Design a protein around this ligand. Structure first.
Ligand SMILES: Nc1ncnc2c1ncn2[C@@H]1O[C@H](COP(=O)(O)CP(=O)(O)OP(=O)(O)O)[C@@H](O)[C@H]1O
Ligand SMILES: [Mg+2]
Ligand SMILES: [Zn+2]
Ligand SMILES: [Zn+2]
Ligand SMILES: [Zn+2]
Lengths: 61, 49, 45, 263, 97, 48, 51, 66, 44, 144
RNA sequence: UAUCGAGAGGU
């Protein structure tokens, strides 16, 4: 998958506005390693923005 | 190594009291409950579960 | 390549891994990595 | 039937007597003011530079505790309910801080007054770091020495103290009733004489002591509740008491809605 | 591991058989094992740093031995002195007086 | 406890602990109980 | 003057390079003024002798 | 390390009173009276200022590492 | 004169630690080893 | 080495029997008994022959066998992670290889963060040892 | 994902 280990911002949910890294993206349900507290959370891939060449891009990267 | 030995499916942590648990219960942290496992045989009655 | 900082004189510089490990300014051989390019967030709780 | 008597008042504390209500209502109001009255507070800190002797999250924790003006926070949305991506101008206030020490000598003390509001849901009065006077530097945040720098960008969000105590508008809430123990709700510990050994309520002169003959009124209930609401300045004391009543109402209203929908 | 799974629970030193009793799991947040206060006595457990051990049976046969022989309620009376080894203690005993 | 065990069996007897605990701990939560330095102090006559 | 070996120096003793200096230069040597010595540094590890 | 922003027990802000407290002590006031003047009425709040130790002054002596 | 008080006793004790500190039995012992014992041991 | 806590000796909800204790969550929120925790990891390059030495680097999968299972994507080109980066257990924080005796010629000798720990990289020391080979320390910080 | 030891600790 092309978005593992890439930095992410969360746009929905209780973790909205928080930075993270895609630790595991098996399918549809991703595991983002939050930066702020030491915990890796389950989150749907729809909830993520990925960083790319120009700003934070949804899962069209 | 023979009269006693180290074993799989074991766990250990600090203990606390709970006034709201039954006498025969043990409260188990989620992280421990996700590391330990039980091998349940698949039958018609539990395959969906 | 990678930014460092001299533990004695605080000069900032880069090294291309093959360079010897010392400060160009004072020759000190104890140096420290500079902070990450990445943004850091904290929850203020 | 509810009655109110404001004993004293000022910006950050109101002393008042509350009467002709149930104990449970005075207590639920006490709890609501402590735990569920929204305020605004820093909840996300973007550290672009921190070469001070303090750790990033050490500083972030102090930032969250800085009281911010929350007067218009009721018209502001929660981040979790806002349709935007990341934070935005309708659900957050952005503050920025930048400090530096130039000079080879001395120490620069960084205060909460150097927090500069950059954006926010205009023209709502929310997001300014609370100040006592006009010459008030506010809360000490950090200290800097030659070449040490602090450059942070803060996102402030609406929240309640159930989530984190930094969103509470109160400090203590003094609260008492029956200063002469006529109701017999407490049984006093003593060595020789209970009356001489226990101090007087500060509201002892607001009710009359029991007469030496008086029989025990086993039907009396608590009915006069003296309380003082102190705040941190994010909200004025009268605002906390008013919004406490409002918040407890919406909570009961939502329950009533759900019952009338279960039909 | 899931609610009501039988597990063997144990505090050292394992001086007698009710140092190892079978409990019903209740999965809970936070990182401690939780005990009803009335089982502290047979374990000689308290909460000043004590730790305890949990073992998970791996078959229908060993689950049944735990639930039908070792379970806490089966252990309330011990053959040591033909009397109970568990009672009301601490807050509940102070309070019941 | 000994009697309920013999008379009602281990299941009922195990519930007995929980029942007693839940009533008493509630009552004690709302009654309170403490101890302080004062409880070590005998009066001046007894000290003499 | 033939060299017969090296002897580990107890910090803050009379033969330690820290005995002079004084708080100003202690701070420059990254040394804490609350550290009273009485121990050695052997391969980076602080070792104390037990009476 | 540095004066806490809030009283741990009640939440009252005390992080804006550290300089004023040191100043009252220079002016010769006794600690109890200085706390009284600062309107620190509850003893939880008084403990915060009375027993704080300003260690950041010690940490600053260590010549910055950049 | 007058009587030596408890506060005076603590004045004496402060003087002890002012001169000796807390680890002087470590430092003085090692100092004697460098000053004298190595030399004497060689001449044994 | 401690804090002045406001303490009630009381039976409250029964969650402090047998030497446990009830702590005020709001006091914790405001900083009570909070602490920093630091762990330093040390590694250095070893010599096995005249020109056979270990090397700090981010090891490429094509040339190095027995890579660790954790991520190597937080390592810089010098084989070291940079301060400010969040790390979780088994993440690689020091990349190091050892050559294989006589393509695909090196063997992994990297250091993962301890599996039971997490936090933020606080400081990274790079230097040489008494023998002239490279020598590193990685300090991790978290708040408990 | 080493082995052999040592030391300091927890109930
Ligand atoms: N060295 C040791 N060897 C074996 N078991 C030990 C031990 N130290 C402690 N224990 C275990 O821990 C128990 C000690 O409990 P403690 O907490 O040390 C004292 P107590 O008698 O329960 O309470 P007290 O502190 O009120 O006197 C022993 O009875 C035993 O169960
Ligand atoms: Mg114990
Ligand atoms: Zn230099
Ligand atoms: Zn928004
Ligand atoms: Zn207080």
């Amino acid at each position: 998958d092309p978005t593992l280990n890439k930095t992410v911002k969360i746009r929905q949910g209780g973790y909205k506005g928080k930075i993270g890294i895609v630790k595991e993206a098996n399918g549809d349900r991703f595991r983002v390693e939050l930066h702020n507290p030491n915990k890796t959370i389950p989150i749907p891939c729809s909830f993520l923005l990925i960083e790319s060449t120009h700003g934070w891009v949804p899962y069209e990267d | 190594n023979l009269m006693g030995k180290r074993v799989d499916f074991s766990a250990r942590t600090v203990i606390s009291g709970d006034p709201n648990l039954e006498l025969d219960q043990v409260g188990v942290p989620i992280s421990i409950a996700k590391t330990l496992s039980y091998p349940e045989t698949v039958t018609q009655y539990n395959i969906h579960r | 390549g990678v930014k460092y900082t001299c533990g004695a004189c605080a000069h900032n510089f880069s090294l291309n891994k093959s360079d010897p490990v010392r400060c160009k300014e004072c020759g000190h051989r104890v140096i420290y990595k500079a902070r990450t390019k990445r943004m850091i967030q904290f929850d203020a709780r | 039937e509810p009655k109110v008597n404001i004993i004293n008042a000022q910006d950050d504390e109101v002393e008042l007597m509350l009467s002709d209500v149930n104990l449970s209502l005075a207590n639920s109001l006490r709890r609501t003011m402590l735990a569920e009255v929204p305020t605004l507070a820093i909840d996300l800190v973007e550290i672009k530079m921190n070469t001070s002797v303090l750790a990033d999250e050490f500083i972030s924790h102090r930032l969250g505790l800085i009281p911010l003006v929350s007067e218009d926070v009721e018209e502001m949305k929660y981040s979790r309910d806002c349709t935007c991506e990341d934070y935005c101008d309708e659900c957050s206030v952005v503050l920025e801080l930048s400090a530096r020490h130039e000079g080879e000598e001395g120490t620069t003390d960084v205060y909460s007054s150097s927090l500069i509001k950059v954006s926010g849901p205009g023209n709502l009065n929310v997001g300014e770091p609370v100040r006592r006077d006009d010459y008030d530097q506010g809360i000490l945040l950090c200290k800097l020495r030659n070449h040490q720098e602090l450059n942070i960008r803060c996102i402030a969000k609406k929240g309640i103290a159930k989530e984190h105590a930094k969103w509470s508008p109160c400090s203590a809430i003094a609260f008492e009733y029956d200063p002469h123990n006529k109701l017999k709700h407490t049984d006093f510990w003593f060595e020789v004489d209970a009356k001489k050994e226990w101090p007087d309520s500060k509201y002892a002169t607001w009710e009359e002591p029991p007469k030496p003959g008086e029989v025990f009124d086993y039907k009396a209930k608590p009915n006069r509740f003296y309380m003082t609401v102190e705040t941190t300045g994010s909200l004025k004391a009268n605002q906390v008491f008013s919004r406490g009543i409002k918040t407890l109402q919406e909570k009961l209203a939502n329950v009533l809605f759900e019952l009338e929908n279960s039909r | 591991l899931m609610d009501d799974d039988p597990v063997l629970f144990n505090r050292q030193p394992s001086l007698h058989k009710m140092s190892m009793m079978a409990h019903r799991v209740k999965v809970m947040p936070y990182s401690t094992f939780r005990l009803n206060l009335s089982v502290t006595s047979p374990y000689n457990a308290d909460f000043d740093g004590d730790e305890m051990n949990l073992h998970v049976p791996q078959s229908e046969e060993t689950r049944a031995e735990l639930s039908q022989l070792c379970a806490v309620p089966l252990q309330i009376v011990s053959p040591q002195s033909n009397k109970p080894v568990m009672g009301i203690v601490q807050d509940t005993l102070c309070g019941v007086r | 406890i000994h009697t309920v065990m013999r008379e009602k069996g281990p299941k009922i007897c195990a519930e007995l602990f929980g029942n007693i605990q839940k009533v008493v701990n509630y009552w004690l939560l709302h009654n309170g109980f403490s101890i302080g330095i004062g409880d070590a102090i005998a009066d001046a006559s007894t000290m003499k | 003057k033939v060299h017969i070996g090296k002897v580990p120096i107890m910090l803050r003793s009379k033969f330690c390079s820290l005995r002079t200096l004084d708080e100003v230069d202690l701070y420059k040597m990254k040394e804490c003024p609350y550290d009273m010595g009485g121990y050695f540094v052997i391969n980076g590890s602080e070792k104390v002798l037990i009476a | 390390m540095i004066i806490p922003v809030r009283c741990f027990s009640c939440g009252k802000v005390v992080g804006d009173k550290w300089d004023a407290y040191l100043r009252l002590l220079e002016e010769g006031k006794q600690e109890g009276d200085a706390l009284d003047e600062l309107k620190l009425k509850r003893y939880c709040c008084r403990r915060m200022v009375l027993t704080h130790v300003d260690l950041i002054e010690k940490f600053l002596r260590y010549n910055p590492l950049e | 004169d007058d009587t030596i008080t408890t506060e005076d006793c603590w004045t004496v004790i402060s003087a002890f630690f002012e001169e000796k500190g807390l680890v002087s039995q470590q430092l003085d012992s090692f100092d004697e080893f460098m000053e004298t014992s190595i030399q004497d041991l060689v001449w044994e | 080495a401690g804090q002045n806590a406001i303490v009630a000796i009381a039976c409250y909800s029964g969650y402090n029997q047998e030497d446990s204790m009830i702590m005020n969550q709001s006091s914790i929120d405001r900083g009570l008994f909070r602490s920093l925790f630091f762990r330093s990891y040390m590694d250095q390059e070893k010599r096995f022959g005249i020109s056979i030495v270990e090397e700090f680097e981010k090891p490429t999968r094509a040339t190095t066998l027995r890579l660790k299972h954790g991520t190597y994507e937080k390592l810089d080109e010098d084989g070291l992670i940079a301060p400010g980066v969040r790390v979780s257990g088994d993440d690689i924080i020091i990349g190091k290889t050892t050559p294989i005796p006589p393509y695909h010629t090196k063997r992994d000798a990297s250091t993962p963060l301890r599996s039971t720990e997490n936090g933020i990289v606080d400081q990274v020391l790079l230097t040489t040892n008494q023998e002239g080979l490279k020598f590193v320390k990685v300090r991790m910080r978290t708040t408990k």
